[PDB]
Amino acid sequence: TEFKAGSAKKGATLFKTRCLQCHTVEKGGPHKVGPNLHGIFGRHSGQAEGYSYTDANIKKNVLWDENNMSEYLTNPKKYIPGTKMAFGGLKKEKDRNDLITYLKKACE
Amino acid sequence: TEFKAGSAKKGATLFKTRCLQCHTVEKGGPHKVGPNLHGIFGRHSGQAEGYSYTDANIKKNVLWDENNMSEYLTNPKKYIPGTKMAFGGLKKEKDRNDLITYLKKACE
Amino acid sequence: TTPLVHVASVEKGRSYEDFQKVYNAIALKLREDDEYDNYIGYGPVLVRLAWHISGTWDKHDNTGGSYGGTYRFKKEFNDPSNAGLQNGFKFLEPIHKEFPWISSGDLFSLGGVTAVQEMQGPKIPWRCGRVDTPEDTTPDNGRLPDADKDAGYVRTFFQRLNMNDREVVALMGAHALGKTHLKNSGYEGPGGAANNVFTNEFYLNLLNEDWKLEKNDANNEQWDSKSGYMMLPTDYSLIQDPKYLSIVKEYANDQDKFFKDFSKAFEKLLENGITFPKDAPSPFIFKTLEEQGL
Amino acid sequence: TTPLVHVASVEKGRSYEDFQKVYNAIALKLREDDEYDNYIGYGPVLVRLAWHISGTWDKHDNTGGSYGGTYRFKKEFNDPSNAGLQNGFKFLEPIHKEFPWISSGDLFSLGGVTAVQEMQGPKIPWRCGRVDTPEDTTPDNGRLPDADKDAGYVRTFFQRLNMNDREVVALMGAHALGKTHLKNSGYEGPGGAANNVFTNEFYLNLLNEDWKLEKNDANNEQWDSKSGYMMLPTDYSLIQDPKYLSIVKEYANDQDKFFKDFSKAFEKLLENGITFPKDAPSPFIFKTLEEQGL
Numbered sequence: 001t002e003f004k005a006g007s008a009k010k011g012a013t014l015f016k017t018r019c020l021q022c023h024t025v026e027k028g029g030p031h032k033v034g035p036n037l038h039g040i041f042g043r044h045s046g047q048a049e050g051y052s053y054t055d056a057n058i059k060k061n062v063l064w065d066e067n068n069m070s071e072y073l074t075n076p077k078k079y080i081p082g083t084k085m086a087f088g089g090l091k092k093e094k095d096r097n098d099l100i101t102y103l104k105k106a107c108e
Numbered sequence: 109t110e111f112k113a114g115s116a117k118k119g120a121t122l123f124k125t126r127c128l129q130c131h132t133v134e135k136g137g138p139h140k141v142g143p144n145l146h147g148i149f150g151r152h153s154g155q156a157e158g159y160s161y162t163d164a165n166i167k168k169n170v171l172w173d174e175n176n177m178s179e180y181l182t183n184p185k186k187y188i189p190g191t192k193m194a195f196g197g198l199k200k201e202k203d204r205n206d207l208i209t210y211l212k213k214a215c216e
Numbered sequence: 217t218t219p220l221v222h223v224a225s226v227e228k229g230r231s232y233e234d235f236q237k238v239y240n241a242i243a244l245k246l247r248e249d250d251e252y253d254n255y256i257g258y259g260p261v262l263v264r265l266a267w268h269i270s271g272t273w274d275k276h277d278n279t280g281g282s283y284g285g286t287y288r289f290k291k292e293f294n295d296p297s298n299a300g301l302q303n304g305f306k307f308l309e310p311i312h313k314e315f316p317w318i319s320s321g322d323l324f325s326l327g328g329v330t331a332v333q334e335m336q337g338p339k340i341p342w343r344c345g346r347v348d349t350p351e352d353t354t355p356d357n358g359r360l361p362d363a364d365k366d367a368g369y370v371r372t373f374f375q376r377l378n379m380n381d382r383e384v385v386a387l388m389g390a391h392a393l394g395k396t397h398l399k400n401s402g403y404e405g406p407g408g409a410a411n412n413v414f415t416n417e418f419y420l421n422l423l424n425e426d427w428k429l430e431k432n433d434a435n436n437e438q439w440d441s442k443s444g445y446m447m448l449p450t451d452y453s454l455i456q457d458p459k460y461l462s463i464v465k466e467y468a469n470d471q472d473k474f475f476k477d478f479s480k481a482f483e484k485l486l487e488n489g490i491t492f493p494k495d496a497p498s499p500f501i502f503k504t505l506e507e508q509g510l
Numbered sequence: 511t512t513p514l515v516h517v518a519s520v521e522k523g524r525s526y527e528d529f530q531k532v533y534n535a536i537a538l539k540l541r542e543d544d545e546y547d548n549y550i551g552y553g554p555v556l557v558r559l560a561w562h563i564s565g566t567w568d569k570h571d572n573t574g575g576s577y578g579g580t581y582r583f584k585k586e587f588n589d590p591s592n593a594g595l596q597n598g599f600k601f602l603e604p605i606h607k608e609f610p611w612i613s614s615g616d617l618f619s620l621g622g623v624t625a626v627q628e629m630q631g632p633k634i635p636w637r638c639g640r641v642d643t644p645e646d647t648t649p650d651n652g653r654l655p656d657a658d659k660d661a662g663y664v665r666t667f668f669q670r671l672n673m674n675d676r677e678v679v680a681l682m683g684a685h686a687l688g689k690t691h692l693k694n695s696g697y698e699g700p701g702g703a704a705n706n707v708f709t710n711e712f713y714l715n716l717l718n719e720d721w722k723l724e725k726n727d728a729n730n731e732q733w734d735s736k737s738g739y740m741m742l743p744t745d746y747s748l749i750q751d752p753k754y755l756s757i758v759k760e761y762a763n764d765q766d767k768f769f770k771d772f773s774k775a776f777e778k779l780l781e782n783g784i785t786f787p788k789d790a791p792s793p794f795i796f797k798t799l800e801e802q803g804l
């Protein structure tokens with residue numbers, strides 16, 4: 001393992017403040033500057049129906065799991081150089097884990 | 109103020125692990141590797157006797173408050189060069205607040 | 217005997233690496249305290265603080281600017297247009313005691329530089345040499361802009377700072393960062409989704425989003441979008457002005473041109489009212505924490 | 511066929527600050543994960559990690575040593591004398607995923623050097639070029655020493671590592687760091703008040719404190735002081751032996767000598783069994799996070 005179970009309660013908080021103004025968790029939810037995170041696990045890149053990904057995102061398709069998600073959120077541009085997602089990055093491993101536990105629940 | 113208030117229950121769990129081996133806080137506490145810290149606030153440095161301070165600690169003779177203590181516990185050697193206290197330091201701001209708050213209580 | 221002259225005097229024996237240390241200390245604390253203002257970080261307010269202290273400049277009498285570091289003093293500190301900048305100083309105080317050799321003005325402006333780069337913005341060249349002056353010479357309150365005005369006010373105001381059309385639109389790209397707080401200025405909300413990462417989002421939202429004039433709970437009027445974004449009237453007037461709109465759409469679909477114009481303009485702002493000798497060293501380009509592998 | 515010859519081959523395309531960035535990644539995670547082991551920190555176990563992977567060396571047939579970096583296997587991971595080291599391996603796993611190009615050996619050894627420096631210890635010159643051997647190759651268990659022995663055992667055991675009396679007593683100064691864990695080795699407690707700060711306290715406590723041979727909760731006999739400290743039998747041997755004793759006092763009164771000699775010995779230890787080419791880069795000396803202004 002790399003990720004491990006943290007608080008899904010604080011991960012929600014991290015989603016409310018650092019993602020919710022972008023990302024929607026719920027099934028078939030509205031879009032935004034980016035995509036809808038429903039079913040983002042067991043998932044290639046750029047699948048999200050209806051959203052127009054810059055081809056930079058879908059030009060590397062590797063299935064999102066609990067681990068590669070961790071260091072994508074550490075620095076989105078060190079992972080996918082040319083993504084149109086503007087985000088500071090979760091530099092704290094705790095903050096990463098806790099948010100990963102929430103997204104595996106709300107994006108069921 | 110410069111530094112805010114933190115958790116005294118978190119500060120006590122910072123003292124048992126990082127201080128209690130060298131220091132005692134309660135009134136009439138036995139002098140250990142380091143001096144007893146009871147009523148350290150509002151007292152000059154290298155003041156409480158029964159202990160042999162290095163003259164570098166007594167050298168700059170400072171009055172202990174919340175903000176000057178906080179940087180001394182960030183880097184004990186930078187703030188007082190030639191100090192006998194072997195401490196890595198509290199690089200985390202919350203950790204400094206929580207401990208000082210507890211220390212402020214126990215020194216009473 | 218003619219307007220004030222402020223000579224840049226380099227702190228004794230200090231070079232590139234000394235000031236890189238100060239940058240690092242600040243840049244680290246930006247990453248450590250990520251909870252501030254509901255997780256936007258101290259980035260935006262530090263950018264604002266550097267602007268506000270150097271925005272106090274007046275080209276005619278050469279009073280104010282970022283030179284004197286006169287902001288530590290009381291009078292210009294409790295100024296109404298200054299609400300919220302307390303957090304900007306509480307942030308920098310521990311850095312100042314770790315590097316007590318650096319002048320208040322150099323630290324104030326370096327915080328602005330450090331914030332921009334760490335929020336993944338342009339590289340901003342920064343000069344040292346600012347020195348502290350007594351409370352004796354402290355800029356009076358009320359020489360910073362009003363938010364409830366129009367483009368004519370904006371253009372006219374910035375002539376005092378020696379900024380022309382192209383420059384003021386660039387500098388105004390920084391309102392992508394952070395948000396507006398009702399308890400501070402009487403306006404409320406952010407200007408976009410990403411307000412702690414330096415982007416041209418300001419110009420894109422200004423152009424693309426749909427804006428409505430509304431009352432807020434402070435009864436001031438601000439332009440609101442249904443996405444939850446807001447714009448100051450002065451910000452909105454950047455599209456109400458023909459020649460301002462020219463530059464807005466320019467930075468809109470080209471981020472690199474904006475980035476390079478912002479850098480030059482920001483650097484002039486922080487350096488305004490300061491005379492640099494030839495003896496003075498070429499400006500520093502501080503590397504980020506990623507570039508240092510930190 | 512002659513004993514094996516392990517030649518240093520620099521990670522192709524990598525230079526000084528490629529590694530200095532790896533140093534920083536470790537120094538950073540050290541400061542972040544400060545909660546480990548009741549706020550002892552990952553520092554000690556990282557020092558232990560670098561020792562136990564270097565302690566597998568045998569001068570007679572040049573088997574084992576840090577060159578391999580075989581710690582990722584099963585047969586030397588479950589060693590009774592090795593319990594607790596996995597916390598060090600898991601600590602390094604994220605940074606090896608970050609730098610996939612670096613060799614396991616060079617990482618484990620660097621990790622130990624990074625720990626000692628960041629804990630305010632002496633500078634340990636480090637070198638690169640360790641390369642990963644086949645899964646086929648892996649040192650047999652029982653290559654590492656036993657704590658329930660005398661000075662004769664220590665002297666004899668360390669001969670295999672090409673270490674003399676002075677080097678041994680130097681390297682032992684590290685047992686000032688961290689503690690012994692009953693769940694791990696069957697021994698319990700620290701050897702001093704400062705166990706996350708590199709000091710000569712080990713020798714001081716070994717002389718000034720009053721030691722009594724007791725029986726812990728794992729039925730193992732250890733030396734305990736009424737100040738709370740403890741000493742492995744092998745450590746207490748250093749004041750039983752007369753030749754070892756004089757060196758203990760030398761380091762007790764002279765910390766800079768201890769630092770100077772630890773640096774030499776520790777570097778030697780990490781660089782045993784690896785033969786460096788002459789065109790190979792001069793040994794690296796990385797600057798601490800404190801020296802980079804953090």
Ligand code: HEC
Nearest residue numbers: 018019022033034045046053054057083084085087409410
């Ligand atoms: C707006 C400012 C955003 C914030 C804040 C966060 N994200 Fe984002 N995300 C955004 C965009 C515009 C895109 C698409 C980029 C592209 O090139 O098309 C994304 C993408 C993602 C993805 C990948 C989706 C996929 O591969 O199909 C993930 C997994 C993701 N975003 C997650 C995520 C999280 C957890 C965030 C906060 C912690 C977050 N993002 C911030 C826009 C924005």
Ligand code: HEC
Nearest residue numbers: 126127130141142153154155161162165191192193703704
């Ligand atoms: C031993 C390993 C120590 C640890 C861990 C901590 N302290 Fe300490 N302390 C120690 C010594 C040897 C000294 C004397 C310094 C000298 O130069 O002689 C001190 C001193 C202090 C003081 C100042 C006392 C005075 O001014 O009269 C303070 C305020 C103090 N120590 C606090 C402190 C805290 C809060 C610690 C944990 C967070 C801590 N110390 C660790 C020995 C050791």
Ligand code: HEC
Nearest residue numbers: 260261264267300361362363387390394395396397400401
């Ligand atoms: C180069 C930078 C810069 C310039 C120039 C600038 N601003 Fe801003 N200002 C900021 C930033 C960044 C914030 C967000 C601060 C925060 O979120 O704490 C801000 C916030 C504000 C706020 C709200 C503060 C609060 O807490 O509610 C007002 C009002 C404001 N600016 C007015 C103006 C006006 C009027 C002008 C010019 C006509 C101007 N500013 C020019 C950077 C700038």
Ligand code: HEC
Nearest residue numbers: 554555557558561594655656657684688689690691694695
């Ligand atoms: C240069 C470094 C070094 C050398 C050489 C060394 N050790 Fe240690 N050892 C350590 C460190 C560091 C720890 C504490 C690690 C921790 O706290 O996780 C330790 C702890 C131990 C422990 C307890 C581990 C636990 O988790 O309980 C035992 C047993 C031990 N050493 C035996 C020995 C013996 C026997 C020798 C030599 C005869 C030896 N070591 C040589 C660094 C070293």
Ligand SMILES: Cc1ccccc1N
Nearest residue numbers: 391393394395406407
């Ligand atoms: C619109 C806006 C957003 C963020 C900060 C300031 C402003 N004005």
Ligand SMILES: Cc1ccccc1N
Nearest residue numbers: 685687688689700701
């Ligand atoms: C005796 C001892 C004390 C502290 C850390 C390690 C050891 N081995």
